[PDB]
From a paper:
However, the post-translational autocleavage of the nascent polypeptide between Asn266 and Thr267 generates an active enzyme with an α subunit (27 kDa) and a β subunit (9 kDa). Based on the X-ray-crystallographic structure of NylCA, we reported that four αβ heterodimers (molecules A-D) form a doughnut-shaped quaternary structure. In addition, we proposed that the nucleophilic N-terminal residue Thr267 in the β subunit functions as a catalytic residue for either autocleavage (from precursor to active enzyme) or substrate hydrolysis.
His130 and Leu137 in NylCp2 were located in a loop between helix α1 and β-strand β7 (designated “loop 3”).
Numbering used by the authors:
A (entry chain A), B (entry chain A): 19 to 259, 267 to 355
C (entry chain B), D (entry chain B): 16 to 28, 31 to 260, 267 to 355
The structure:
Amino acid sequence: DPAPRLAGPPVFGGPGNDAFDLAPVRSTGREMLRFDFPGVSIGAAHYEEGPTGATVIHIPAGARTAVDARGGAVGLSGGYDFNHAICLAGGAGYGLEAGAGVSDALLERLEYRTGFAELQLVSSAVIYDFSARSTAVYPDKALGRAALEFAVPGEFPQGRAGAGMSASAGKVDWDRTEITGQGAAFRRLGDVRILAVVVPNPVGVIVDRAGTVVRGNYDAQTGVRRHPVFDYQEAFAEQVPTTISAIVTNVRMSPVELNQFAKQVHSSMHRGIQPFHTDMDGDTLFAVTTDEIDLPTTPGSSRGRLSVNATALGAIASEVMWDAVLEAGK
Amino acid sequence: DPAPRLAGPPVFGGPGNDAFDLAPVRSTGREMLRFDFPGVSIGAAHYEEGPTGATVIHIPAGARTAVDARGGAVGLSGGYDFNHAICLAGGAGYGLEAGAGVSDALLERLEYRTGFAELQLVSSAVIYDFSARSTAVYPDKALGRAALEFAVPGEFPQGRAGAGMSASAGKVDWDRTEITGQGAAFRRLGDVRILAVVVPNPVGVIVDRAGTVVRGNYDAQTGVRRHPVFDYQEAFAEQVPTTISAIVTNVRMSPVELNQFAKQVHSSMHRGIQPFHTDMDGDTLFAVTTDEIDLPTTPGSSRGRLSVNATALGAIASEVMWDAVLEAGK
Amino acid sequence: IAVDPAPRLAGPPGGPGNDAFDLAPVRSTGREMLRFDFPGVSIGAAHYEEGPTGATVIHIPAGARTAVDARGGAVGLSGGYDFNHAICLAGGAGYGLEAGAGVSDALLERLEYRTGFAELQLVSSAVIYDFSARSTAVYPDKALGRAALEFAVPGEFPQGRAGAGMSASAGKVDWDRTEITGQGAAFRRLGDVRILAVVVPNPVGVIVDRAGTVVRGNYDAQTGVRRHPVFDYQEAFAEQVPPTTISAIVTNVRMSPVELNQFAKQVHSSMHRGIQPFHTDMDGDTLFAVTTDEIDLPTTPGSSRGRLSVNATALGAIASEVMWDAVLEAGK
Amino acid sequence: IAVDPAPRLAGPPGGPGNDAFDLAPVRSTGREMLRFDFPGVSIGAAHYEEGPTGATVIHIPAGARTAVDARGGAVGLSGGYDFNHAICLAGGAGYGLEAGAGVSDALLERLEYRTGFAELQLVSSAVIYDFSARSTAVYPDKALGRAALEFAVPGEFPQGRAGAGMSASAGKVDWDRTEITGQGAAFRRLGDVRILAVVVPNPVGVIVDRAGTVVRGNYDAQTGVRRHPVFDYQEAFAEQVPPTTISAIVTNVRMSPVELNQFAKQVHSSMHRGIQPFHTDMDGDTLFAVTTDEIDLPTTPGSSRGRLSVNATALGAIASEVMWDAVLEAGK
């Protein structure tokens, strides 16, 4: 079991953006994941004054996207089927403004051309992170721009960085909520590349492949984390009577294939986050392809007649995302 | 590890319905689950000539329903937001006919009244089970009627029964596909009741709470089952370059609450079935409430401030469904 | 289209069900045959006089990519597949989905009971509630769907009271003003491009022509005219609150799944011109957009008539007119 | 509504962006003020002359249950919440969603930066692409959304070229025939029942009146008339293939989420009467249906005007006429 990171109770009444001269900081988190994915960059910026942040995945060429918005409490802007960037942020609905900062900077980079085909498209999604801190500072337009400016190829700052600065898990009761973080993982299989990025702020808890609860719902009185279903079932016997994420790959997929891939990978995250896709969550996954590599025409291999196709890619990517969720909770 | 139940390769060219004088059999499966849920009945009937079957959940008063049709290959009829019965069947799209048998018998029971408010509503979903046998016999109208006629309170035939007769799992390669079954589980918490019913015919495999693969993708050469992601990742390194279910409860939920509950419980099944919600699956879950018991107005209890609500019910029901999936694969 | 001004009030509704009768399917001929040229697409229509009720089957043996736009709040749909060998439209409300099983079974038998994934015969079915327009509980069953499929003829469609349209009706602010409609089709070929529209309007609302005249439904026998329903609705409100259509559009122009799905929404929404109100909570409105994927639109959308004049949107506008013509044939 | 027959061709399109200007928000007054009586619902409209481009904000401080019907194939939407304190409509395409952030920020500040879940200020925003109708890259930004919110006045709406409608335009088979539209509103009270419609039509299609006349968009300067786009589309096909609207409808009648969502689809589809074609792949058509949940429909739907005459469907029909009136004010 990891040491606890209890968020502690929120002291409400704290200052907001207008009280500060807010200074973007490039997020470095606890350690840097390095990987090789040409054409993809990541920037993360935060305000210490929150603490809260945004994380921007920039794909300058633009890339086909499916969105799976699955929770009951989704905060999403654009949700486009083609994106030059994905912006994830804290600050609840207010933090969608970070995406406008990214959009504006892309327009300027494009010399303010505005033909239909040249529109710079940014989809943004948010987590509510106001309970995990004592200020009302939200990621703003300037912070979005900073995150884009900080974006570099082949790097991701793990842990408390960017949108993950004040992410937290395990919300049966706030006294047992723990700070998580943001996480990424990367796998290369021949020419195939899969990057997962995740900012888990779940009502549920993070669970590992052995079924151990590793982050969220920590009881200080007992020193142990519990699966929420134990609390829930006891409450019923007694009283009766959000995760935002992206999977980026270079494998060509049709719009239909890509959408089903998104749904598959997203549902797969109920393994590592439990419960998941609840009415209290606004879980949103972006599936993005750079469309560089074809699947073979027939799905066969030494490992099986139906072994090479988009379902197979979905299963592999599902493991990469689990690894990312675990990096976040570490 | 359970003994293998390999489906074996299909011998194609087999006879269909018109070759037989088809005789419904009341399915008893391997053992009977008994439970107490007034107002709910289950019947299961099969044709030995398939073997293939249908399973009918009958709720004569009628009950609010949400449908979560999540796969890429869904075969569904009605999908109504209010149902007097749910009919699950083999026979791929052809087996949707069983539901028409249930509908017709309900109409007759209603003395052929047809006012809007008296329409008898049956939603049906199917699995493709033609690979797991050597005939083209599909559940028909007569078999649907038989299943309804066989329906009794408080009983469910586990295993190879009804729609589960020729269900199978683990389809990276047919040489490793195993027969599953159908399954149910029941929990009562004070006055709250939760029944799960499932017919897993997944491309993926059934996995237990320890992460062990317990049914599907069995390799006769090695005597061991593998998680499909191992086959998939090796295939990629080499070559580059359906589950239908119902959750029935007596807790009142609004249409919005009930729909989100459906999505939550359905995603939860990616724990016990992996992969899940793939393009090759037609996964369909029905969430049905009898609307007999209110949740409290505020969600609080000794176990947490947010511990009694529909998300909490969803987490509990998710465990019941896992238990049902495991009964199916047993 | 010369709509008949004469009323055909459905009239007010313990009638027997199917097995009370020895039901023999009848090949529907309706009031008139539409003839059209669209190889690969066949239509069969069958009814039971004992209803009266019927089914109408579009048979496309090659299979064809399909988008389903199920817009109503009372939809009755089976399959809803993104690829179909047949579309089955039927009366009998939810019970009439059984007709689609008859079609499915017949197609399976024709294949000699082959059941490989690529060989699965896919039929999508949708229904109208037509029990208020008659005094039996007879519905389109397995045998009637099978019969409609067997009666399917290339390049013909029976207009009017035929197949699913036998007891279709419009204008349901009050049943005293509800009129029998029918089914309808219309067809257009524009240099190679073929568009077929099929419609069974059983609307809560009324059928309206291009001039804005109500031509079928909401006939007040005390005035001998048809008003727009909104006039009744607004009077009712002033008083009491004091201070299904199922259709297919089939084309031979290739469209991606995304284009075909938006084409389906566009054509379906366009039917709120010919049927008013439309897409209501009591309607189960369902449109099937089908492409046989025979011919490509040019790579670029240009013509002497504009830079954005040859694309799927343009096809949608054109198909929307073919659908309006079909609605008006049903109401004629 | 007396639509002006005179053309207002947008005309053909390296113009500078926001920071090139010292941008001062202007309170839009348009051509005319609509006045209406609907306590709790305010509208503010602000524009930058340097665009010209604008934002239009509907402010409902109590918060109100909302259904979003995003029907187009090119939708630009932020939030899309099922409960809103404001709806923000803007030009500037995707960049103009930023205006909604200005509104959101202002509302948060008004709350003194309280951030409890129940206190979250919810703004849904949708946009039109209005860059072809002008020669700058100026878009509605944070400051302009904030300004529109500050300018919001109970019971007034500026018709015409104002707020989001400043550079809205219709009829885009070819840009040479595209005309400037505007924004529009209309309001009806029927004994207690209040319905407000707000619309910013930037359609690919054209605005059409109740007689079926094209009144805005697709003006051919060589003929001095407006044809229906389908005439261009079908000629183009014969030749080349040889052998956004964002809107809100606000009412005070209580509707469940299910009813409100079907009400939204019904009213939105009804706009294919006034705008043709509509819901196309190049459109991002988005309608917001909002109820302030003030008054109940009777428990049963009866009246002297029919057994099914007082329900949400009826309200939908009535609101559909208010929306058509709003579309025509925008095109006037």
